[PDB]
RNA sequence: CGGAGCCAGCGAGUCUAACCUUGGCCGAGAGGUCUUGGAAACUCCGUCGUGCUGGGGAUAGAGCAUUGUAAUUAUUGCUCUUCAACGAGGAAUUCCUAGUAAGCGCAAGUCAUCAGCUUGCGUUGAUUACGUCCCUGCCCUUUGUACACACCGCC
């Protein structure tokens, strides 16, 4: 088993449900106000858990990639923008939310600070991530 | 109305037709004998059967 | 394995394996009254109050 | 070198084309 | 061009 | 009596392939749901212009089907259907959107009226496509019509164009969308109800042809 | 050139159509000393057919198609070093 | 000040009159320099 | 005001209606920052 | 056959250098009057409607021309597909807000590519409804081409027309040099008893040569036979810089 | 060595057109007998179905794996057989462009061991192809011969 | 030292290199198994190379496929081309030639764009 | 219209002496007032108050102008002519809240914008007149009815001789066009229970 | 039928601009247009002078 | 709308103590600060909803910063309200035949033109003719010479 063996949704929302019913995340508190970007036009629709889903998504994403930082995660989670009548140009995501979810993963023990900067998978989190994908396939 | 099926056997070139309407020499299927010239609209190859509602009226030029 | 409940303006369907709400139906312009299933279990007929 | 790349001649052949728990410094002593 | 020009210039 | 055995071990690859896929490996069904066997064209004169003799898996066989005169009459009928359906100003090159709405469309014509959806679309094509037609004869400037016939390629082309633009006109901006309105318009044209836009236009064209024949 | 064929077409030009020196100018070999070894081992075709005698004069209209055969060790190691060995068509 | 290049030659009725009497004198000579079948 | 965002306006009885009017009339001390204005 | 196109273009560079030492030129002497040339006209990329009707006017201007569509045609396989079609000239048009500005002529079988800025155009599609063009294989007239560069541009510019027109062949096309600005008009006429009366029709413009490269259109490594010098301190003092 | 397909009118002995289209040298031609299409075949691994009559000049390329020699056409004008350089025969429908089948013929020809060799007598691809093909007039049998004695 | 074979396939700009070697069934695209191909609606377009011939011709092999470049549907056409011609090359040079040209006849009877691509660009009318 | 200088002036018969011959046609047929009176009676008819119509007026110049049932035409003629060139130039005029749209110009032909199944008649003084009540009552209630009522002053009603079949009128008498369309709308009222 | 009144203006000229409701921005609409056409005129004329 | 996934290709002259970057931290946001080095369209899963609609953002106010010395005619970004106009465009007209029309972004700025833009690069990708000289026209010919067989046989 691995994380690459299981698809996007079937790993991400399963790990989100796992981190939900564990509850060891400590959500930022200024959740339910924020927009995950500067170009969204609403907060997320499932405010009792979108932080858990985002934590699972960044866990999968740093499993698949090697070493990431908050600026790279911002540039990747950003998108287009209906800024007005003018033609459209790319925007960035929300650095405070990305730093909060990476600090939450640091205090859990899934990620850790690597050389050349950046955050990578720890050993306990490495054992932890693919197990819930194995129970997904189970 | 009794519709009938009929197989084309020769697309008459060189006739003076309306652009987009090609004459053709079709022949029936209930008997394989009696032929009739009709004028069809779309792209038509040889020996692809087309449908006829009128059974007896011959065709002509389209000026 | 599924059952449908009919609240006001909001029809839910639950599953028998976990007993939590799994799907909703809320395109109802008034209170919604009768929820029923076809015998092949594939389509839900809901009679509401607008008609 | 761009001109030689545009005339690469794709059938050239010669005989020469056949082929931690430590600190930083002691990896050199190891190798 | 030539038709109407030549006709108008001769007639 | 008679018996042929070819495989002997139970073949299971190291990657787990889904059971519907290794069931489909026996006989190719469309979208892994619909057999191209037992589909016949109940009308004559449109066989070899619709094409339901090749079991494909999904209507995206992107071969070159237009650089000859008549060789757009051999790519299959539902691929011509989704390719004719893909085009408007809001969508060109949105073919995966067109494929997913044709998938929802034939799925719900199954869940309403289970004959099988490719049978429904084929005899819908045959009942839709008109049989006589009118052209503008010249006459120096007189607006006189004249009656001609239509080749089967023109019948199939105008049939898929009438079905697609009828679903467009039926879900331009009202309650439903293009998927279920193509479903309802196509089952009306398959049954022959004369309530669909397709058979309305066929009856109108044949009526004016019959009138000024 | 019409009348000055008296002076230029010499040994150094009439031997310049030879398959070893055309091979070396096409850079298919290191030198003539192993280009003759290759085309004597019978690895080198010109046109559709293989050519083995190392005195062949490749003409003007055949210089474009003097290439290695499929299924040969040198073609295999060339495609291996370039790492493009498309092994469907034999090599 | 000074400028780099001559600007675009604006098309005036005088320059189209000189071009037209050039070409009509030329074809009154019928001295058009086309190719030949050779 | 703790209302499910699809429990439509024909619903939502008096304690939630008084609560949301109380939010809209006293909007400072409900942990809403200068986002509000 | 990349070694074949490289060998033939290297032979072409040698032939051009040898002819420039021992100075119809070298690139055109095989086909000066035998083969009637064929011309492929394209626009830049996703053209405007005004540019497209200008390209239609150019295709109607000189015959044996097709107006090939240009959207997502990559330039190298465009020119090598044109080579495998075995036609002779390519003509590319670059616009600016509907006003055409660049006319690139490329005699693409390893031949020269000239490039022309294209200043003041007038399109008959947006002035005059008078009917069709004449479309006869025309006559050509050229005014004071005397420089060596002038002979080169008149060679590569008149070797794209139909060879050997008749006496009755009506339309004349002029290329007049007014201080390094080739002005182009084209006319039809009749012979009156007093003289001749012309009729202006089709496009009019003027083009200034600004590059003339020996390679084909796609390469950009082509050795420059001539390009103008905008920033010498004697730019506006002579012609054919 | 000019990569083209020339056509002449046999009524007036002039060159009709320099019917180009390939990228390399052509090697084998045939006209049909029922629609009179041309079926050229050239060393750019490509056969090329041409229709040169009636206002169109329709081109249609078909792309084979290896190099191509030795074309022949069935006398009912419905398909065309072509050899390859990779010891194979293919047959192509021509109102379509799909194949019908490829006869593999590189294991059943015995070229001879030359007296000017270092190599073996079987592995050396000397004439492991078919330089000439022909159909039979019933339409089924195909005879084929190459530079080897088989 | 295992019997390996390597093939290439490419639509418009995508490129797919496939390494077929004697394995036990697993089929990988960038490490991820063949069940998870990204655009999710052409998964049968990538299945049908290993569905025309039966999985028993895939029981003995395993395929690792790296894919770079190109868009979504060009990538999935490149994967189906690499899978098909890698399977026929492995059967060309490691098991029987009758099985090889039986596979080749089956693929060229379904459609020959599964094996070779019309890679010659346009007509100048 | 005619932009003279100053600004527009409409084309009536009575608004000048010789602008009709100045443009190059006849003052005897310069007749927009019968169009105004005919359309205002069609708008103020009770079947229009019930909303069973849509009025496509047109001219000789090929244009097609649709008016809604909800149009309140100005009651005078001078305000109507002031509205007319606003229609003929801006091609679209609003309501008092400016969201909707009531007097539009549409594409040709009229047969495109007509309903799916519809019976086609004209005004025909040269016709055996069927009684309008049982004429509408004859056919069933799935195909619509259209009248191609001419706003001609004098001449032949051959304008729609390419789709219209049933050449029928209201009498053999000299009527006005407002009376003809009002007789047909009242016959539709008696046919459809209004 | 709910009936509405068509908005239009007496002696309607398309060449003239429409009846401005607000006098406080009517002159700025006239001048932000005039200014733009006069700026285009003076820039076109000075560059023709320069050439 | 809200989450989630994912694939390109052209391109390579820099401020290197104030430019561009990898990474840490601060703020919802823009941006700041400290250190290192010199890809949209698309797909999937959820929420509305046939309504000037939430599409739509023109305009006005309020607040946080970056820079233009010092706002002092609001330097541009962001946050919340204010929700005007606007509903696919007549007469006609123009263009277009396959990796084409079209949709989509990404680069560069290559002596002439182009920054409001210009040119390249890829991505997705169809419908309809592919015949006819009837209409509009344009052109050619009216000694067959061209050497067999055949056909035409005084413009």
**Distance (Å, rounded) from C-alpha M11 to C-alpha M23?**
10
Residue N46, judged by CB atoms within 10 A of its CB (0-12, 13-18, 19+), counts as: exposed
**Distance (Å, rounded) from C-alpha A32 to C-alpha I30?**
13
**Distance (Å, rounded) from C-alpha A54 to C-alpha A60?**
10
A42 touches strand O (CB under 7 A): yes
Please tell me which of the candidates D9, D11, D14 has its beta carbon nearest to residue G30.
D14
Give the residue carrying structure tokens 């030659």: H9
K101 touches strand O (CB under 7 A): no
Residue M126 contacts residue M150 (beta carbons within 8 Å): no
Nearest to L80 by CA among F209, F115, L88: L88
Residues 108-137 of chain J within 7 A of strand O, judged by CB, are 115, 117, 125, 129, 131-132, 134-136
Nucleotides of chain O touched by protein CB (<7 A): 1-9, 22-32, 39-52, 55-58, 61-64, 78-80, 84-87, 89-92, 94-103, 105-106, 111-114, 116-135, 137-140, 146-150
User: In K, which residues are within 8 Å of G59 by CB distance?
Assistant: none
G–J contact: 3+ Cβ pairs < 8 A: yes
Collapsing DSSP states into helix, strand and coil, what is residue K5?
strand
Is M156 annotated as belonging to a binding site? yes
Q: What angle do CA L9, L12, L18 make, to 5 degrees?
A: 20
Is M174 annotated as belonging to a binding site? yes
H-run or E-run covering M58: strand M55-58
Q: What is the 3-state secondary structure (H, E, C) of chain G?
A: CCCCCCCCCCHHHHCCCEHHHHHHHCCCCCCHHHHHHHHHHCCEEECCEECCCCCCECCCCCHHHEEECCCCHHHHHHHHHHCCCCCCCCC
Nearest to L88 by CA among L64, L105, L110: L105
User: In F, which residues are within 8 Å of B1 by CB distance?
Assistant: none
Residue A79 contacts residue A94 (beta carbons within 8 Å): no
Nearest to M168 by CA among M134, M136, M121, M135: M121
Q: Do L97 and K101 touch (CB under 8 A)?
A: no
Nearest to F146 by CA among F208, F201, F83, F192: F208
J227 touches strand O (CB under 7 A): yes
**Distance (Å, rounded) from C-alpha H20 to C-alpha H18?**
5
- The CATH number covering residue B48 comes to 2.40.50.140
- What's the CA–C1' distance between F73 and O127, in Å? 13
Nearest to J97 by CA among J73, J116, J121: J121
- C27 interfaces chain I, CB cutoff of 8 Å: no
Residue M133 contacts residue M187 (beta carbons within 8 Å): yes
Strands J205-213 and J196-200, sheet pairing? unpaired
Split into its structural domains, chain L has a count of: 1
Collapsing DSSP states into helix, strand and coil, what is residue F157?
helix
- The CATH number covering residue F80 comes to 1.10.455.10
- The CATH number covering residue L124 comes to 3.30.230.10
**Omega before M109 cis (within 30°)?**
yes
Q: What is the 3-state secondary structure (H, E, C) of L70-113?
A: CCHHHHHHHHHHHHHHHHHHHHHHCCCHHHHHHHHHHHHHHCHH
**Distance (Å, rounded) from C-alpha F158 to C-alpha F201?**
10
Q: Do L124 and J40 touch (CB under 8 A)?
A: yes
Is M157 annotated as belonging to a binding site? yes
Collapsing DSSP states into helix, strand and coil, what is residue N4?
strand
Q: What is the residue-wise DSSP string for K46-110?
A: EEEEEE-SSS--EEEEEE-SS----EEE-TTSSEEEEE-SSSEEEEEESSS--EEEEEE-SSS--
Distance (Å) from the C-alpha of residue E8 to the closest C-alpha of chain J?
Answer: 12
Q: Do B50 and F152 touch (CB under 8 A)?
A: yes
User: In A, which residues are within 8 Å of L37 by CB distance?
Assistant: none
Q: Looking at the C1' of nucleotide O118, which residue has the nearest alpha carbon?
A: J96
A36 touches strand O (CB under 7 A): yes
Sheet of F145-149, strand order: B50-52, B4-10, B22-28, B35-40, F145-149, F132-136
Helices in chain M by DSSP H: which ranges? 19-23, 33-44, 46-50, 78-90, 110-113, 132-138, 177-191
Residue C43 contacts residue F111 (beta carbons within 8 Å): yes
Q: What is the 3-state secondary structure (H, E, C) of chain J?
A: CHHHHHHHHHHHHHHHHHHHHCCCCCCCCCCCCCCCCCEEEEECCCCCHHHHHHHHHHHHHCCCEEECCCCCCCHHHHHHHHHHHCCCEEEEEEEECCEEEEEEEECCCCCCEEEEEECCCECHHHCCCCCCCCCCCCEEEEECCCCHHHHHHHHHHHCCCCCCCCCCCCCEEEEEECCCCEEEEEEEEEECCCCEEEEECCCEEEEEEEEEECCCCCCCCCCEEEECCCCCCCHHHCCCC
Neighbours of M7 (CB within 10 A): 15
Q: What is the 3-state secondary structure (H, E, C) of A107-131?
A: HHCCEEECCCCCEEECHHHHHHHHH
Q: What is the residue-wise DSSP string for chain C?
A: -EEEEE-SS-EEEEETTT-SEEEEE---SS-EEEEEE-TTS--EEEEES--
Residue J201 contacts residue J188 (beta carbons within 8 Å): yes
Residues 170-209 of chain J within 7 A of strand O, judged by CB, are 170, 208
Residue M122 contacts residue M160 (beta carbons within 8 Å): yes
Q: Can you give the residue range of the structural domain that contains L33? A: 1-125
- M116 interfaces chain F, CB cutoff of 8 Å: yes
User: In G, which residues are within 8 Å of K117 by CB distance?
Assistant: 42, 52
The angle that helices A123-137 and A8-22 make with each other, rounded to 10 degrees, is 110
Q: Which two tokens stand for residue D20?
A: 């931690």
Is F28 inside a domain boundary?
yes
Residue K47 zone, left/alpha/beta (φ > 0; ψ -120 to 50; rest): beta
Q: Can you give the residue range of the structural domain that contains B33? A: 1-63
Q: Looking at the C1' of nucleotide O5, which residue has the nearest alpha carbon?
A: A8
The CA-based diameter of chain L, rounded to the nearest angstrom, is: 53
Residue B51 contacts residue B4 (beta carbons within 8 Å): yes
Distance (Å) from the C-alpha of residue L32 to the closest C-alpha of chain A?
Answer: 5
**Distance (Å, rounded) from C-alpha J238 to C-alpha L18?**
64
**Distance (Å, rounded) from C-alpha C34 to C-alpha C4?**
10
Residue K32 contacts residue K93 (beta carbons within 8 Å): no
End-to-end alpha-carbon separation of chain M, Å?
38
Split into its structural domains, chain F has a count of: 1
Bridge partner residues of J198 (DSSP): J189
M59 touches strand O (CB under 7 A): no
J234 touches strand O (CB under 7 A): no
F72 touches strand O (CB under 7 A): yes
A21 touches strand O (CB under 7 A): no
Is M56 annotated as belonging to a binding site? no
- M97 interfaces chain N, CB cutoff of 8 Å: yes
**Distance (Å, rounded) from C-alpha J65 to C-alpha J91?**
10
Contact partners for chain N, using 3 or more CB pairs closer than 8 A, are H, M
Residue M168 contacts residue M121 (beta carbons within 8 Å): yes
Residue C19 contacts residue C33 (beta carbons within 8 Å): no
Q: At L24, phi and psi to the nearest 5?
A: -140, 20
Is M135 annotated as belonging to a binding site? no
Residues 142-161 of chain J within 7 A of strand O, judged by CB, are none
- What's the CA–C1' distance between I36 and O72, in Å? 30
Strands J89-96 and J99-106, sheet pairing? antiparallel
**Distance (Å, rounded) from C-alpha L83 to C-alpha C36?**
48
Q: Give me Rg for the CA atoms of chain N.
A: 18
The conformation of residue F212, written as its DSSP 8-state character, comes to T
Exposure string for F63-83, b = 16+ CB within 10 A, e = fewer: eebeebeebbbbbbbbbbbbb
Q: Looking at the C1' of nucleotide O127, which residue has the nearest alpha carbon?
A: F84
Split into its structural domains, chain A has a count of: 1
Distance (Å) from the C-alpha of residue J82 to the closest C-alpha of chain K?
Answer: 10
**Distance (Å, rounded) from C-alpha J78 to C-alpha J43?**
12
J5 touches strand O (CB under 7 A): no
Split into its structural domains, chain B has a count of: 1
Collapsing DSSP states into helix, strand and coil, what is residue F211?
helix
Residues of H at the N interface, defined by Cβ within 8 angstroms: 7-8, 10
Strands K79-83 and K71-73, sheet pairing? antiparallel
Distances (CA, A) of L54 to G15, J116, L48, L58, L101: 59, 62, 10, 8, 15
Q: Do B40 and F157 touch (CB under 8 A)?
A: no
């Amino acid at each position: 088993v691995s994380v690459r063996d299981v698809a996007a949704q079937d790993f991400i929302n399963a790990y989100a449900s796992f981190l939900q019913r564990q509850g060891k995340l400590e959500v930022p508190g200024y959740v339910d106000i924020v927009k995950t970007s500067s170009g969204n036009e609403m907060p997320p629709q499932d405010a009792e858990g979108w932080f858990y889903k985002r934590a699972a998504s960044v866990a999968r994403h740093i499993y698949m990639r090697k070493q990431v930082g908050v600026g790279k995660l911002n540039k990747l989670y950003g998108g287009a923008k209906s800024r007005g009548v003018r033609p459209y140009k790319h925007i960035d995501a929300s650095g405070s939310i990305n730093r909060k979810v990476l600090q939450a993963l640091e205090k859990i023990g899934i990620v850790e600070i690597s050389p050349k900067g950046g955050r990578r998978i720890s050993e306990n989190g490495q054992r932890d991530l693919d197990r819930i994908a194995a129970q997904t396939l189970e | 109305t009794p519709v009938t099926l009929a197989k084309v056997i020769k697309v008459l070139g060189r006739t003076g037709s309306r652009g987009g309407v090609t004459q053709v020499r079709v022949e029936f299927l209930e008997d394989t004998s009696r032929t009739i010239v009709r004028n069809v609209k779309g792209p038509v190859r040889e020996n692809d059967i087309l449908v006829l509602m009128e059974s007896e009226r011959e065709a002509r030029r389209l000026r | 394995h599924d059952f449908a409940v009919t609240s006001s303006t909001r029809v839910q369907i639950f599953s028998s394996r976990t007993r939590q709400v799994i799907k909703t139906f809320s395109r109802f312009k008034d209170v919604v009254y009768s929820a029923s299933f076809r015998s092949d279990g594939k389509l839900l007929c809901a009679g509401d109050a607008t008609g | 070198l761009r001109e030689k790349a545009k005339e690469r001649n794709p059938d050239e052949y010669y005989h020469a084309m056949h082929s931690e728990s430590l600190s930083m410094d002691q990896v050199k002593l190891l190798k | 061009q030539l038709k109407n020009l030549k006709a108008a210039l001769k007639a | 009596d008679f018996e042929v055995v070819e495989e002997f071990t139970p073949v299971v690859l190291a990657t787990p392939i889904p059971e519907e896929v290794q069931q489909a490996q026996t006989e190719i069904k469309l979208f892994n749901k619909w057999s191209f066997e037992e589909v016949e064209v109940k009308d004559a004169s449109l066989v070899d212009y619709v094409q339901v003799r090749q079991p494909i898996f999904v209507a995206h066989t992107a071969g070159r089907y237009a650089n000859k005169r008549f060789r757009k009459a051999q790519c299959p009928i539902i691929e011509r259907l989704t390719n004719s359906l893909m085009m408007n100003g809001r969508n060109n090159g949105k073919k995966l959107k067109a494929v997913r709405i044709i998938k929802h469309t034939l799925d719900i014509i199954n869940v309403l009226t289970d004959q099988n959806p490719i049978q429904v679309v084929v005899d819908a094509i045959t009942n839709t496509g008109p049989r006589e037609d009118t052209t503008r004869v010249g006459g120096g400037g007189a607006a006189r019509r004249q009656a001609v016939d239509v080749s089967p390629l023109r019948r199939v082309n105008q049939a898929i164009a009438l079905l697609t633009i009828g679903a467009r006109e039926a879900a331009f901006r009202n309650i439903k969308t293009i998927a279920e309105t193509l479903a309802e318009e196509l089952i009306n044209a398959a049954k022959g109800s004369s309530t669909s836009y397709a058979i309305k236009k066929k009856d109108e064209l044949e009526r004016v042809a019959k009138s000024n024949r | 050139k019409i009348s000055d064929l008296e002076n230029k077409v010499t040994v150094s030009a009439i031997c310049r159509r030879r398959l070893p020196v055309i091979m070396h100018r096409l850079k298919m070999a290191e030198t003539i000393q192993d280009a003759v070894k290759f085309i004597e081992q019978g690895h080198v075709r010109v046109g559709p057919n293989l050519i083995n005698d190392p005195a062949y004069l490749v003409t003007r209209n055949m210089e474009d198609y003097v290439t290695w055969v499929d299924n040969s060790k040198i073609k295999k190691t060339l495609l291996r070093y370039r790492n493009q060995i498309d092994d469907f068509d034999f090599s | 000040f000074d400028r780099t290049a001559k600007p675009v030659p604006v098309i005036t009725s005088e320059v189209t009159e000189s071009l037209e009497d050039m070409i009509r004198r030329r074809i009154q000579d019928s001295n058009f320099d086309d190719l030949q079948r050779r | 005001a703790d209302v499910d965002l699809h429990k439509r306006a024909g619903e939502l009885t008096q304690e939630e209606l008084e609560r949301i009017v109380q939010i809209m009339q006293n909007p400072t001390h409900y942990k809403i920052p200068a986002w509000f204005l | 056959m990349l070694r074949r196109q490289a060998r033939e273009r290297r032979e072409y560079l040698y032939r051009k250098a040898q002819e420039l030492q021992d100075s119809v030129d070298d690139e055109y002497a095989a086909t000066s009057g035998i083969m009637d040339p064929r011309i492929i006209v394209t626009t830049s990329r996703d053209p405007s409607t005004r540019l497209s009707q200008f390209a239609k006017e150019i295709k109607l201007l000189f015959p044996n021309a097709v107006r090939l569509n240009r959207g997502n045609y990559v330039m190298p396989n465009l020119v090598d597909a044109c080579k495998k079609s075995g036609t002779t000239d390519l003509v590319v048009l670059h616009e600016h807000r509907g006003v055409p500005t660049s006319l690139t002529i490329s005699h693409f079988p390893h031949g020269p590519t000239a490039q022309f800025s294209l200043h003041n155009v007038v399109m008959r599609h947006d002035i005059i409804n008078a009917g069709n063009q004449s479309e006869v294989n025309p006559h050509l007239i050229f005014d004071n081409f005397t420089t060596a560069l002038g002979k080169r541009v008149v060679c590569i510019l008149k070797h794209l027309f139909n060879a050997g027109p008749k006496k009755d062949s009506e339309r004349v096309i002029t290329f007049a040099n007014r201080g390094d600005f080739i002005s182009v008009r084209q006319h039809v006429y009749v012979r009156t008893r007093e003289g001749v009366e012309i009729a202006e029709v089709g496009p009019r413009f003027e083009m200034r040569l600004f590059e003339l490269r020996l390679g084909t259109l796609e390469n950009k490594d082509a050795d420059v036979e001539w390009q103008l010098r905008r920033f010498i301190r004697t730019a506006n003092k002579k012609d054919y810089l | 060595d000019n990569f083209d397909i020339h056509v002449w009118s046999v009524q007036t002995g002039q060159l009709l057109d320099a019917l180009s289209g390939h990228e390399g040298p052509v090697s084998c031609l045939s006209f049909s007998q029922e629609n009179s299409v041309l079926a050229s075949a050239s060393w750019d691994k490509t056969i090329r179905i041409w229709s040169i009559f009636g206002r169109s000049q329709q081109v249609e390329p078909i792309e084979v794996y290896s190099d191509v020699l030795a074309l022949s056409m069935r006398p009912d004008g419905k398909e065309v057989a072509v050899s390859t350089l990779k010891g194979q025969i293919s047959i192509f429908n021509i109102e379509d462009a799909k194949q019908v089948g490829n006869i593999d013929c590189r294991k059943d020809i015995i070229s001879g061991r030359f007296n000017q060799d270092r190599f073996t007598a079987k592995n050396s691809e000397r004439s492991k192809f078919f330089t000439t093909i022909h159909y039979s007039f019933d339409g089924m049998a195909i005879v084929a011969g190459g530079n080897n004695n088989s | 030292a295992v019997p390996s074979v390597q093939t290439f396939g490419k639509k418009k700009s995508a490129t797919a290199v496939a390494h077929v070697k004697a394995g036990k069934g697993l089929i990988k695209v960038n490490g991820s198994p063949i069940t998870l191909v990204e655009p999710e609606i052409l998964r049968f377009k990538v299945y049908e190379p290993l569905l025309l011939v039966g999985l028993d011709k895939f029981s003995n092999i395993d395929i690792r496929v790296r894919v770079t470049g190109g868009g979504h549907v060009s990538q999935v056409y490149a994967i189906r081309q690499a899978i098909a011609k890698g399977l026929v090359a492995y059967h060309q040079k490691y098991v029987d030639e009758q099985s090889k040209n039986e596979l080749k006849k089956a693929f060229t009877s379904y459609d020959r764009t599964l094996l070779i691509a019309d890679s010659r660009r346009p007509e100048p009318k | 219209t005619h932009k003279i200088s100053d600004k527009y002036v409409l084309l009536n018969c009575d608004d000048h002496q010789g602008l009709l011959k100045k443009m190059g046609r006849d003052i005897s047929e310069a007749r927009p007032d019968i169009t105004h009176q005919c359309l205002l009676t069609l708008l103020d008819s009770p079947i229009n108050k019930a909303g069973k119509l849509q009025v496509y007026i047109q001219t000789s110049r090929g244009i097609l102008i649709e008016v809604n049932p909800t149009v309140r035409i100005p009651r005078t003629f001078k305000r109507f002519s002031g509205l007319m060139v606003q229609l003929l130039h801006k091609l679209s005029i609003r309501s008092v809240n400016s969201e909707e749209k009531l007097l539009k110009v549409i594409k040709n032909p009229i047969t495109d914008h007509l309903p799916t199944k519809c019976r086609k008649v004209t005004l025909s003084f040269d016709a055996p007149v069927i009684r309008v009540q049982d004429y509408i009552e004859k056919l069933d209630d799935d195909e619509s009815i259209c009248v191609f009522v001419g706003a001609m002053a004098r001449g032949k009603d051959n304008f729609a001789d390419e789709y219209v079949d049933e050449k029928v009128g209201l009498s053999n008498y000299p009527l006005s066009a407002s009376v003809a369309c009002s007789k047909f709308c009242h016959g539709a009222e008696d046919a459809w229970n209004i | 039928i709910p009936t509405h009144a068509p908005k239009y203006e007496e002696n309607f000229n398309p060449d003239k601009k429409s009846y401005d409701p607000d006098r406080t921005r009517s002159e700025i609409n006239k001048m932000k247009a005039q200014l733009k056409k006069e700026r285009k005129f003076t820039m076109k004329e000075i560059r023709k002078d320069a050439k």
